[PDB]
Amino acid sequence: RDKRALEVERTVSLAEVYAGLPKDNGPFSLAQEIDKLVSQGSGSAGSG
């Protein structure tokens, strides 16, 4: 049963993942939100 699998490499940019969220999910620019969250003592961005 140990059939040879295809070996696939995929690159993922999280900024694209967050920027691309549906509007209802609170899409955001990752670098900008990090800057704000670091400057602040707390907070969040996005959802779910």
Binding site: G26, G43, S44, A45
Partner: protein
């Protein structure tokens, strides 16, 4: 009126805050004023 000026992140933050403060208060009130004696509730853990 004041909460009407909040964005969704702020609204979620506000509500989370209020719910936590509010349950502490309700739980305290309940144990001392509402809880029936039959229920041996001494603290918040027992109330749960």
């Amino acid at each position: 009126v004041l909460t009407a000026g909040l964005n969704s992140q702020q609204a979620n933050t506000l509500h989370a805050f209020l719910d936590e403060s509010r349950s502490a208060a309700l739980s305290t009130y309940y144990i001392r004023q509402v809880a029936k004696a039959a229920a041996a509730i001494k603290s918040r853990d027992d109330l749960y």
